[PDB]
């Protein structure tokens with residue numbers, strides 16, 4: 386696909402839970418990682434989402450938070466993907482951070498320049514990408 | 527309204543589906559286009575949303591993806607608005623892209639500078655704005 | 668926590684409404700302000716959210732809209748926090764705006780540079796931060 390989102394992950398539906406107006410879709414990524422997404426029930430049905438369906442998960446860079454220390458907090462954001470900072474491209478007030486994940490999957494996040502300083506992000510650094518389930522778009526081939 | 531969101535569209539509710547905690551609102555835009563939004567049920571009731579109600583849909587620029595080629599994928603994002611690139615304002619790491627839609631409605635998206643290069647966006651270029659239903663705020667006059 | 672989100676608010680759950688796949692959580696902030704969040708029901712249960720639980724609400728800067736005049740519109744976005752512009756850091760195409768709220772809580776928003784001009788934001792200026800309920804992550808200690 387030619388889409389602006391910097392994150393386009395391939396995977397397979399491992400389970401679906403249909404709600405009233407939304408549906409929760411659990412996805413197993415190409416390399417061990419798991420994601421959850423909430424999409425409208427009309428999309429889950431239109432896309433024919435079911436266990437075993439191959440899909441792509443699409444996440445824009447400004448929808449990914451970065452965390453270097455949870456400090457014992459447990460978050461509601463269902464998607465926590467841990468890796469190492471690969472590249473940092475700094476702009477004026479924002480910076481594009483790409484992390485390398487387990488298996489070689491990369492994830493890019495757009496965060497303020499002040500976050501980069503405060504978390505100590507630099508190539509090599511451990512960090513986790515955090516993505517709320519409602520910020521994941523799914524796609525079917 | 528004096529609000530930072532760059533996209534404020536006028537329209538009318540064409541249908542409402544009330545869920546348990548959320549509600550799906552389908553909107554017909556001023557010129558042919560359609561949108562779907564998911565808002566809390568408490569807001570749908572507080573705003574008195576019903577078929578025929580005039581409303582505004584509010585979308586911040588960083589919530590709009592741009593796509594130039596779906597490559598046969600079908601996305602869950604309910605809102606796909608196709609047009610032509612009007613203006614590009616490039617910053618350091620991000621760029622503000624405005625598209626002109628059918629009827630003359632404009633939509634602005636904030637994407638990384640690398641997306642602009644990779645999709646070949648430039649004034650005149652065909653592209654679609656993609657917005658997940660959960661990233662639309664609605665307003666009533 | 669060491670997390671990129673610029674907004675991390677402490678508060679207590681004042682009520683919870685469980686849906687089919689999502690749950691709505693109403694939170695009373697440390698100083699008078701209130702927030703609503705929509706998270707998956709699986710998270711609400713995993714985090715053991717109930718009335719009186721102390722939590723943190725996490726919101727990234729690009730998820731906060733700024734409004735200086737509603738012009739009589741009522742929005743669906745459940746979280747409207749009013750204060751005064753404290754600092755503005757301008758980048759190339761975006762600018763980071765921090766507002767000081769009632770009690771001394773600060774909230775930072777990332778908006779286009781054109782929004783800053785158009786709303787007349789500058790230190791001292793009245794403005795409200797607007798955050799859709801689905802853009803709030805919750806955390807438990």
Ligand code: MOO
Nearest residue numbers: 389390391446638
């Ligand atoms: O659509 Mo982007 O380039 O991930 O902000």
Ligand code: MOO
Nearest residue numbers: 461462463518707
């Ligand atoms: O349960 Mo979440 O905070 O919507 O990923």
Ligand code: MOO
Nearest residue numbers: 530531532587779
């Ligand atoms: O509130 Mo904005 O200027 O669409 O990012």
Ligand code: MOO
Nearest residue numbers: 425602603604659
């Ligand atoms: O059905 Mo969606 O929530 O527009 O991806």
Ligand code: MOO
Nearest residue numbers: 497671672673728
């Ligand atoms: O993760 Mo942010 O974009 O620095 O609030």
Ligand code: MOO
Nearest residue numbers: 566743744745800
């Ligand atoms: O009811 Mo909302 O989801 O804060 O627009």
